[PDB]
Amino acid sequence: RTADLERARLGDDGLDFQDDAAQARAFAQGVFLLEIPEWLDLSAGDRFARQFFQGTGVEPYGKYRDLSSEHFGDELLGYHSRVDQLEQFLLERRFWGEVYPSEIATLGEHLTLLSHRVLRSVLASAGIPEEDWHRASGGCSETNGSYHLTFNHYRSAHQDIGLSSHKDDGFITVLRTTAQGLEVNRDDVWEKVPVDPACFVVNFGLSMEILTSACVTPLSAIMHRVSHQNFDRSSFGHFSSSRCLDDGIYRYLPSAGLERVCGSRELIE
Ligand SMILES: O=C(O)CCC(=O)C(=O)O
Ligand SMILES: [Fe+2]
């Protein structure tokens, strides 16, 4: 009912789990906890997630409610009401400096570099040659990927599930949640992700699963969901996926290199 997750920290040689066994369990479960660097201020992000949906009467972030999909050439960005309790504000990195408040873009840039370090520690453990990392990761092994900083609010007045079962797109998700609600289908039972506001929740997406399907330890994009909320809940996440402006989505074939599977666009769909 409550999942037991391995905990890691970012140190000098990438991810430091307690030992090599723990790291292998974590990567194999597809979800683990990552301690939040003590210098990293998350308070502006927390407030944005509590406010973005409220409209221009609420300062300083309520006005972002009015930036809907039409203000962007990209269908998927801005404020969106979902079918579940969730509503969201989503923005890819190319737009952070112009659109987000400056302190929110800063948070996004910190998360991007933190996510980059986590991703490289994961690629090394998969036995992929370093010179293939950039193309395998669609740029995320450097700072060339696509990055979404996404803010979530669950409308407890809506009778739906919070957010229905899904696997993330992309390579790596760093999730900041401070309230009960997240659930993962680790083995075959649904389990609650325990609350720990001093850690992020890290999991992988479909592009990571595709990439590593033929490795020694294939990595899985874990199915997860948010249960029906009786009171409001908010959260936010940093999502890394392939740059899509490159082209392809790849699978690594040991001893041979990268095989193109599909495109950036058709995978999101
Ligand atoms: O709000 C959460 O805790 C989960 C959000 C999530 O899984 C997503 O945005 O894809
Ligand atoms: Fe998700």
Q: How far is the CA of 64 from the centre of ligand 1 (A)?
A: 19
CA distance 191 to 185: 6
Closest residue by Cα to residue 41 from 117, 118, 111, 119 = 111
36 secondary structure, DSSP code: P
CA distance 147 to 251: 21
> CB under 6 Å to ligand 1: residues?
150, 152, 163, 168, 175, 177, 182, 224, 226, 235, 237
DSSP string, 192-238: EPPP-TTEEEEEE-HHHHHHTTTSSS------EEEPPPSS-EEEEEE
Ligand closest to CA 223: 2
Q: Please state how this structure was obtained.
A: X-ray
**Tokens matching residue 3:** 């999942």
Q: How far is the CA of 268 from the centre of ligand 1 (A)?
A: 16
CA angle 62, 68, 69 (to 5 degrees): 150
DSSP string, 98-119: HHS-HHHHHHHHHHHHHHHHHH
Q: How far is CA 2 from the centre of its chain?
A: 21
- Structural domains of the chain, with CATH: 7-268 (2.60.120.330)
Q: How far is the CA of 255 from the centre of ligand 2 (A)?
A: 33
**Residue among 111, 149, 164, 175 whose CB has most ligand 1 atoms within 8 A, to mutate:** 175
Closest residue by Cα to residue 89 from 113, 63, 56 = 63
Q: State which ligand 1 atom lies nearest to the alpha carbon of 162.
A: 1
Closest residue by Cα to residue 116 from 92, 146, 89 = 146
What is the four-CA torsion angle of 85, 71, 174, 31, rounded to 10 degrees? 50
All residues with CB under 5 Å from ion ligand 2: 168
**Tokens matching residue 38:** 């003590």
- Which sign does the torsion angle of CA 19, 23, 26, 31 carry? positive
* Beta pairing class for 224-226 and 182-185: antiparallel
CB 173 within 8 A of CB 237: yes
Look up residue 32 and give its amino acid.
Answer: F
Length of the chain (residues) = 269
CB 250 within 8 A of CB 264: no
Which residue precedes each gap in the chain (C to N above 2.5 Å)? 245
CB 169 within 8 A of CB 206: yes
* Beta pairing class for 78-81 and 31-35: unpaired
CB 248 within 8 A of CB 257: no
Closest residue by Cα to residue 225 from 153, 161, 269 = 161
